[PDB]
Scaffold this active site. Structure first.
Site, PDB file in Angstrom:
ATOM      1  N   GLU A 251      -2.852  11.096  12.306  1.00  0.00           N
ATOM      2  CA  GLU A 251      -3.221  10.168  12.619  1.00  0.00           C
ATOM      3  C   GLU A 251      -2.633   8.964  11.685  1.00  0.00           C
ATOM      4  O   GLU A 251      -2.122   8.038  12.698  1.00  0.00           O
ATOM      5  CB  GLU A 251      -4.700   9.788  13.233  1.00  0.00           C
TER       6      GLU A 251
ATOM      7  N   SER B 272       0.713  -1.105  -0.390  1.00  0.00           N
ATOM      8  CA  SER B 272       0.329  -0.246   0.007  1.00  0.00           C
ATOM      9  C   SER B 272       0.824   1.494  -0.287  1.00  0.00           C
ATOM     10  O   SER B 272       1.407   1.614   1.200  1.00  0.00           O
ATOM     11  CB  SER B 272      -0.928   0.013   1.394  1.00  0.00           C
TER      12      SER B 272
HETATM   13  C1  LIG Z   1      -2.627   3.192  -1.622  1.00  0.00           C
HETATM   14  C2  LIG Z   1      -2.245   2.322  -2.783  1.00  0.00           C
HETATM   15  N1  LIG Z   1      -3.216   2.933  -3.937  1.00  0.00           N
HETATM   16  C3  LIG Z   1      -2.874   2.030  -4.993  1.00  0.00           C
HETATM   17  C4  LIG Z   1      -1.660   1.364  -5.407  1.00  0.00           C
HETATM   18  C5  LIG Z   1      -1.998   0.881  -7.081  1.00  0.00           C
HETATM   19  N2  LIG Z   1      -0.819   0.817  -7.743  1.00  0.00           N
HETATM   20  C6  LIG Z   1       0.627   0.211  -7.428  1.00  0.00           C
HETATM   21  C7  LIG Z   1       0.163  -1.995  -7.577  1.00  0.00           C
HETATM   22  O1  LIG Z   1      -1.429  -2.046  -6.797  1.00  0.00           O
HETATM   23  C8  LIG Z   1       1.147  -2.012  -7.376  1.00  0.00           C
HETATM   24  O2  LIG Z   1       1.549  -2.213  -5.530  1.00  0.00           O
HETATM   25  C9  LIG Z   1       0.076  -2.371  -8.808  1.00  0.00           C
HETATM   26  O3  LIG Z   1       0.799  -2.193  -9.638  1.00  0.00           O
HETATM   27  C10 LIG Z   1      -1.053  -3.175  -8.517  1.00  0.00           C
HETATM   28  O4  LIG Z   1      -0.101  -4.550  -8.739  1.00  0.00           O
HETATM   29  C11 LIG Z   1      -1.714  -4.010 -10.331  1.00  0.00           C
HETATM   30  O5  LIG Z   1      -2.858  -2.849 -10.698  1.00  0.00           O
HETATM   31  C12 LIG Z   1      -2.316  -4.859 -10.494  1.00  0.00           C
HETATM   32  O6  LIG Z   1      -2.558  -4.773 -11.633  1.00  0.00           O
HETATM   33  P1  LIG Z   1      -3.144  -6.507 -12.209  1.00  0.00           P
HETATM   34  O7  LIG Z   1      -3.177  -7.193 -13.257  1.00  0.00           O
HETATM   35  O8  LIG Z   1      -4.039  -6.758 -11.222  1.00  0.00           O
HETATM   36  O9  LIG Z   1      -5.282  -5.069 -13.423  1.00  0.00           O
HETATM   37  S1  LIG Z   1       2.004   0.404  -7.831  1.00  0.00           S
HETATM   38  C13 LIG Z   1       1.042   2.084  -8.577  1.00  0.00           C
HETATM   39  C14 LIG Z   1       2.063   2.920  -9.525  1.00  0.00           C
HETATM   40  C15 LIG Z   1       3.209   3.540  -8.503  1.00  0.00           C
HETATM   41  O10 LIG Z   1       3.584   4.700  -9.059  1.00  0.00           O
HETATM   42  P2  LIG Z   1       5.701   4.893  -9.021  1.00  0.00           P
HETATM   43  O11 LIG Z   1       5.808   6.496  -9.331  1.00  0.00           O
HETATM   44  O12 LIG Z   1       4.693   5.714  -7.186  1.00  0.00           O
HETATM   45  O13 LIG Z   1       6.329   4.132  -8.202  1.00  0.00           O
HETATM   46  P3  LIG Z   1       7.014   3.195  -9.762  1.00  0.00           P
HETATM   47  O14 LIG Z   1       7.089   4.310 -11.277  1.00  0.00           O
HETATM   48  O15 LIG Z   1       6.690   1.864 -10.489  1.00  0.00           O
HETATM   49  O16 LIG Z   1       8.331   3.593  -9.396  1.00  0.00           O
HETATM   50  C16 LIG Z   1      -0.446   2.178  -8.333  1.00  0.00           C
HETATM   51  C17 LIG Z   1      -0.644   2.925  -8.810  1.00  0.00           C
HETATM   52  C18 LIG Z   1      -1.326   0.802  -4.714  1.00  0.00           C
HETATM   53  N3  LIG Z   1      -0.759  -0.365  -4.096  1.00  0.00           N
HETATM   54  N4  LIG Z   1      -1.004   1.458  -3.273  1.00  0.00           N
HETATM   55  C1  LIG Z   2      -8.572  13.903  12.600  1.00  0.00           C
HETATM   56  C2  LIG Z   2      -8.525  14.475  13.367  1.00  0.00           C
HETATM   57  N1  LIG Z   2      -8.141  14.046  15.094  1.00  0.00           N
HETATM   58  C3  LIG Z   2      -7.719  15.176  16.222  1.00  0.00           C
HETATM   59  C4  LIG Z   2      -8.768  15.873  16.750  1.00  0.00           C
HETATM   60  C5  LIG Z   2      -9.321  16.555  17.435  1.00  0.00           C
HETATM   61  N2  LIG Z   2      -9.121  17.561  17.986  1.00  0.00           N
HETATM   62  C6  LIG Z   2     -10.289  19.101  17.883  1.00  0.00           C
HETATM   63  C7  LIG Z   2     -11.665  18.807  18.601  1.00  0.00           C
HETATM   64  O1  LIG Z   2     -12.090  17.398  18.036  1.00  0.00           O
HETATM   65  C8  LIG Z   2     -12.576  19.107  17.688  1.00  0.00           C
HETATM   66  O2  LIG Z   2     -12.788  18.825  16.373  1.00  0.00           O
HETATM   67  C9  LIG Z   2     -10.950  18.947  19.909  1.00  0.00           C
HETATM   68  O3  LIG Z   2     -11.108  19.646  20.414  1.00  0.00           O
HETATM   69  C10 LIG Z   2     -12.669  17.831  20.676  1.00  0.00           C
HETATM   70  O4  LIG Z   2     -13.245  18.870  21.161  1.00  0.00           O
HETATM   71  C11 LIG Z   2     -11.122  18.207  22.637  1.00  0.00           C
HETATM   72  O5  LIG Z   2     -10.019  17.501  22.733  1.00  0.00           O
HETATM   73  C12 LIG Z   2     -13.095  17.088  23.318  1.00  0.00           C
HETATM   74  O6  LIG Z   2     -12.799  17.014  24.327  1.00  0.00           O
HETATM   75  P1  LIG Z   2     -13.111  16.140  25.812  1.00  0.00           P
HETATM   76  O7  LIG Z   2     -13.303  17.420  26.652  1.00  0.00           O
HETATM   77  O8  LIG Z   2     -13.463  15.571  25.372  1.00  0.00           O
HETATM   78  O9  LIG Z   2     -11.920  16.001  26.257  1.00  0.00           O
HETATM   79  S1  LIG Z   2      -9.309  20.317  17.430  1.00  0.00           S
HETATM   80  C13 LIG Z   2      -8.071  19.798  17.338  1.00  0.00           C
HETATM   81  C14 LIG Z   2      -6.525  20.933  17.675  1.00  0.00           C
HETATM   82  C15 LIG Z   2      -7.070  22.110  16.258  1.00  0.00           C
HETATM   83  O10 LIG Z   2      -6.092  23.270  16.425  1.00  0.00           O
HETATM   84  P2  LIG Z   2      -6.233  23.673  14.999  1.00  0.00           P
HETATM   85  O11 LIG Z   2      -5.009  24.611  15.018  1.00  0.00           O
HETATM   86  O12 LIG Z   2      -5.903  22.953  13.718  1.00  0.00           O
HETATM   87  O13 LIG Z   2      -7.221  24.779  15.022  1.00  0.00           O
HETATM   88  P3  LIG Z   2      -7.812  26.118  16.312  1.00  0.00           P
HETATM   89  O14 LIG Z   2      -6.389  26.271  17.183  1.00  0.00           O
HETATM   90  O15 LIG Z   2      -8.593  25.557  17.027  1.00  0.00           O
HETATM   91  O16 LIG Z   2      -8.403  27.190  14.982  1.00  0.00           O
HETATM   92  C16 LIG Z   2      -7.798  18.662  17.570  1.00  0.00           C
HETATM   93  C17 LIG Z   2      -6.791  17.676  17.525  1.00  0.00           C
HETATM   94  C18 LIG Z   2      -9.681  16.298  15.418  1.00  0.00           C
HETATM   95  N3  LIG Z   2     -11.103  17.231  15.526  1.00  0.00           N
HETATM   96  N4  LIG Z   2      -9.342  15.443  14.023  1.00  0.00           N
END
Ligand SMILES: Cc1ncc(C[n+]2c([C@](O)(CO)[C@@H](O)[C@H](O)[C@H](O)COP(=O)(O)O)sc(CCOP(=O)(O)OP(=O)(O)O)c2C)c(N)n1
Ligand SMILES: Cc1ncc(C[n+]2c([C@](O)(CO)[C@@H](O)[C@H](O)[C@H](O)COP(=O)(O)O)sc(CCOP(=O)(O)OP(=O)(O)O)c2C)c(N)n1
Ligand SMILES: [Ca+2]
Ligand SMILES: [Ca+2]
Ligand code: NA
Ligand code: NA
Lengths: 620, 620
Positions: A365, A123
């Site tokens: 994350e 992946s």
């Molecule tokens: C998160 C993620 N998204 C898409 C891919 C798919 N992907 C991949 C594969 O899933 C392999 O891990 C596919 O090649 C897969 O094996 C074939 O599609 C299967 O073909 P089929 O015979 O079943 O039809 S490789 C790939 C393109 C990567 O391009 P890059 O420019 O990063 O690498 P490279 O130019 O090869 O040095 C891309 C886009 C991945 N591995 N991971």
């Molecule tokens: C994908 C993702 N990861 C972490 C967060 C958590 N997060 C958030 C919340 O989940 C709200 O959406 C938390 O604030 C949440 O409400 C409290 O933790 C709850 O507190 P409690 O009383 O239950 O203890 S906001 C936040 C920090 C964002 O900092 P930024 O600098 O992006 O924004 P700002 O400075 O506020 O303009 C961060 C880190 C998110 N919303 N989304």
């Protein structure tokens, strides 16, 4: 140690090595009838120089803790990874031809059944995060001399996870980390967006804090030189290459990604490549400095029993932080990671007590999970990463790949269910049991009070695989004696009487709602058995069935989670077909909304009154 | 249209507006007892200037298709979003005080039950991708004058998904898109990594192709000026601000994220802010140019029945591409998105026929899903996004939030199960049924042949919510007549006899393995009923039960998926407790490995021989 500036003979041997690696990649993929020889060929000089000039490692002991690490982030180039390990003398050369066979471990993408693979890739966009964990461990935990090298594709650099890792490495000054970017112009189904605009790659790397060097990726000398200079920053070697390099008529062409050469073509091409090789003599690997420390492998034990008191109130999220900090005093192997939520997950308690072993991962994350996986490789640390359980959905592919990587990481997700109240559904984990139950190596703990939480932390630390601990926001009463024994796969009956009419299975806040329902029902002379699973996976099927048989076969599950993939479905799947057994479910039926915790438990049909009504309905 | 350069009075009114927005954010969060007033206050001038100088929209019709779009990516600033819509006259001002109450729709984070919200936010880092979809739609599909504005936090910029969106916007020249970065120095639990290093933010934005302008984010005049100049590139307004701006003693301090002011403090602070307001008179919104086109809302129908032939072989992944291209000739509303896998998912067929409606999203699945969500907003398009089903795990948080957003998107994931063969487990979707079944608004199609695939595409197009279509790599026979009627929630019995001993439920490759098992068993004078679910969610419980009752109560499920959350658990949960009904499961029990498709179906116990043995076991 000084750079050894190669002579022309060593340079020629590196070219010869690169061409041997091309030949093997072609042979293996033509033999298999599938694979990615063109993706191998762009990287051949990079691989030759890393393995036979730059890196330091024990060729006969790839997992040795003193070795430099190599991470093949573009995992579909697996055949060239296998080829270098044959060239180094670890793998038998004949085995390369068994690529992708069910009789071989040279699988389509790298996996840790191979001694030379730490993390599975395949992946795209995940390898650099793992490499960052390895490098962080090397610099700050092991305090050792090994370096970490990660090879990425250019299409791969479209993944946001890569840029999280870039940022992490500069924040944490990972000057023992090198990213090699194989800028071969082409992705799978079109040119990569930036093609051969090398300057833009350089600007992006520099803007993210890396030292960036553009090289001809098919010059072994430029590669030796660029890899030979250590820096004070993470270093990006931005290598201009051609996809299918060395394959006449295929080099730099579209329509060749993941396409093997047919046998007639492979023969002709291999003859041409072989004609360019000047000597058959192979270069030997050079060994590492042996300065990685010993790490203890013994079971990690809490320094004392939990010190809660029955009747005291504490949220399991806070008990998690307390328990993790406590466990950190027992063993230096424990490390903690969190994504800017430490005040809300309570991992801040661990940071206060053991700051040198806490890693702030910021709001990222996906990368956090990869850092943890990297830190766990070669058993160097025992990581616990935390955030809200909802936001582990952002890292599901990393978690999925962690299981393919046979990784031992611990994940604690807080803020589960509607019981968080007012923040609303964006923050509510309602699919985390489904998600983690589907991860094949997982153990899923759902502690219902502070005592159970501390025991879950201890058990998780000593359990292999992907351990998940689901914590909760509401303060709930301690119900367990602190000397209650807890085990994976062992549930607890927390209320029983001889005349119980339903076995009610709850967890976290719904266990407490079930206990409150029992009190409501006693007023009607109805007794219910209440069962706390402790682990959702594996599920104590025996105790559930034995309980059901004491309660007229009737089970009611109640959970702060969606219907699919959760506790109710786990129980149903465990007992289906057992004579006289019935299972009724209460769960959350749709996306929730803001309100007070009690109001939402009511609205979504999982509070004490809903439970009581369901019980009455079963009796009649 | 010319920039209207504001006079001092208009500037003062914008300051007064910003301060009113502060006051409301404080009042509402103090009333609720929770929320994020300090996150609101850093953005107050930005919000005032956008809503009361820069943007063009109908204040009484927030969903109007001609309006500029605003996306609050930092969704926890919801109270200030609500406050602007009150200031604009859409919301009643009294209602602001009901923030987070179960009696209100002013929930903790924005949600589309609010007319002024298109996408739910709250999981950070997703809003810019949605905004990119909106902007792409505006420039290339609607060809309209509306612009798109997206407000992000600085901590939020640690998410890789943001950088995917940055890159997308420059690739696609989204010069109608503006990102406003609230650089207020602080995240939730520590300073954001770059703090007030404005130059580094500028370098990162520029390296990703944006025009970047650093401003004082508390100067209404600088904001008016910066927002007033259109560019030829996506534009980042990099606003230096202070968290809690205007709250004396809280401004620029840690320990205040997500903390409301206590009532005594709120009163004192509000009096101070109110003392700075020069006039009570509110600015009016300015309306948009009405140049968005009409969009048809009628059901979309394939132009003819499927033209397959029973007995012909085709992989459902290829049938998907054929069917999608076919549907594209029926309606201009259909658009297709894919992440550099179009040759393998067969979405390339659609690209060939309808290139203007195909969006190459590159290797960035998180962003792809967000683009689709943005394109579907206000019903402007009907998106179908595709990749390997395994890689939809990379986008699970985006999919989760799409359901919270009440989004109508279609997702087709190919390469399911071990039956892909040699690539190995990194590419094998074995948890996608668990994942998509847990999404509350989902319909899960698992077509078993080309005919079913074409019907699934058509049905999905006309079905609300998150539609998932699971496609497969092996060529399998067409088994259905092309005039077979298909419906959501309706299964098919594909083999039956009066003396059937087990009902075997399979799907995709395991349906074909079940049919092959039936042929093996007939040699032993054992007949089995074979059932194809068509949709896994919702499941045709009635036909499953009616079938089971004809086969001695016995059901055997067989699936190319892990045990948890898949077909077997869905069936078990549907029928548990029904008298005389038994359910036996065959599924994949652990992370797989490389081999030929048939070899892996054998190894993992889900092929014809495993099915036959399980059937015999049930009979005895
Ligand atoms: C998160 C993620 N998204 C898409 C891919 C798919 N992907 C991949 C594969 O899933 C392999 O891990 C596919 O090649 C897969 O094996 C074939 O599609 C299967 O073909 P089929 O015979 O079943 O039809 S490789 C790939 C393109 C990567 O391009 P890059 O420019 O990063 O690498 P490279 O130019 O090869 O040095 C891309 C886009 C991945 N591995 N991971
Ligand atoms: C994908 C993702 N990861 C972490 C967060 C958590 N997060 C958030 C919340 O989940 C709200 O959406 C938390 O604030 C949440 O409400 C409290 O933790 C709850 O507190 P409690 O009383 O239950 O203890 S906001 C936040 C920090 C964002 O900092 P930024 O600098 O992006 O924004 P700002 O400075 O506020 O303009 C961060 C880190 C998110 N919303 N989304
Ligand atoms: Ca490439
Ligand atoms: Ca901030
Ligand atoms: Na563990
Ligand atoms: Na649909």
């Amino acid at each position: 140690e000084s750079y050894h500036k190669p002579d022309q003979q060593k340079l020629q041997a590196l070219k010869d090595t690169a061409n041997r690696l091309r030949i093997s990649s072609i042979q293996a993929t033509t033999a298999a009838g599938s694979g990615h020889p063109t993706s191998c060929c762009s990287a051949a000089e990079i691989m030759a120089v890393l393995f036979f000039h730059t890196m330091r490692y024990k060729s006969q002991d790839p997992r040795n803790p003193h070795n430099d690490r190599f991470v093949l982030s573009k995992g579909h180039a697996a055949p060239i990874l296998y080829a270098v390990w044959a060239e180094a003398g670890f793998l038998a050369e004949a085995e390369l031809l068994n690529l992708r066979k069910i009789s071989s471990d040279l699988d389509g993408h790298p996996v840790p059944k191979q001694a030379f693979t730490d993390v599975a890739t395949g992946s795209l966009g995940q390898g650099l995060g793992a490499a960052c964990g390895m490098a962080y461990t090397g610099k700050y935990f092991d305090k050792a001399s090994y370096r970490v090298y990660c090879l990425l594709g250019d299409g791969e650099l479209s993944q946001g996870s890569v840029w999280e890792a870039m940022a992490f490495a500069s924040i944490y000054k990972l000057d023992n980390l090198v990213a090699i970017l194989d800028i071969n112009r082409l992705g799978q189904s079109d040119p990569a967006p930036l093609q051969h605009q090398m300057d833009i790659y350089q600007k992006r790397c520099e803007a993210f804090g890396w030292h960036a060097i553009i090289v001809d990726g098919h010059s072994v000398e430029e590669l030796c030189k660029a890899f030979g200079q250590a820096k004070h920053q993470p270093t990006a070697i931005i290598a201009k290459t051609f996809k299918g390099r060395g394959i006449t008529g295929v080099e730099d062409k579209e329509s060749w990604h993941g396409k093997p050469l047919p046998k007639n073509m492979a023969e002709q091409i291999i003859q041409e490549i072989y004609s360019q090789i000047q000597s058959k003599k192979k270069i030997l690997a050079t060994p590492p400095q042996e300065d990685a420390p010993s790490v203890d492998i013994a079971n990690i034990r809490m320094p004392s029993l939990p010190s809660y008191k029955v009747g005291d109130k504490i949220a399991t999220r806070k008990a998690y932080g307390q328990a993790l900090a406590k466990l950190g005093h027992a063993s230096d192997r424990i490390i903690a990671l969190d994504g800017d939520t430490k005040n809300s997950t309570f991992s801040e308690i661990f940071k206060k007590e053991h700051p040198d072993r806490f890693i702030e991962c910021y709001i990222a994350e996906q990368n956090m999970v990869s850092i943890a996986v990297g830190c766990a490789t070669r058993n160097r640390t025992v990581p616990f990463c935390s955030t809200f359980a909802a936001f582990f959905t952002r890292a599901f592919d990393q978690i999925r790949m962690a299981a393919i990587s046979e990784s031992n990481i611990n994940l604690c997700g807080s803020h589960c269910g509607v019981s968080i109240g007012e923040d609303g559904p964006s923050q509510m984990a309602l699919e985390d049991l489904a998600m983690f139950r589907s991860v094949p190596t997982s153990t899923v703990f759902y502690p219902s009070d502070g005592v159970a939480t501390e025991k879950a932390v201890e058990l998780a630390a000593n359990t292999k695989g992907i351990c998940f601990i689901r914590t909760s926001r509401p303060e709930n009463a301690i119900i367990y004696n602190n000397n209650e024994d807890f085990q994976v796969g062992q549930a607890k009956v927390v209320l029983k009487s001889k005349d119980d009419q339903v076995t009610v299975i709850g967890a976290g806040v719904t266990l407490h709602e079930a206990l409150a329902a029992a009190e409501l029902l006693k007023k009607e002379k109805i007794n219910i058995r209440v069962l706390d699973p402790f682990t959702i996976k594996p599920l104590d099927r025996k105790l559930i069935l034995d309980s059901a048989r004491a309660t007229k076969g009737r089970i009611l599950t109640v959970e702060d989670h969606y219907y699919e993939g959760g506790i109710g479905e786990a129980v149903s799947s465990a007992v289906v077909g057992e004579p006289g057994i019935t299972v009724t479910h209460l769960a959350v039926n749709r996306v929730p909304r803001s309100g007070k915790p009690a109001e939402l438990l009511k609205m979504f049909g999982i509070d004490r009154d809903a439970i009581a009504q369901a019980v009455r309905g079963l009796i009649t």
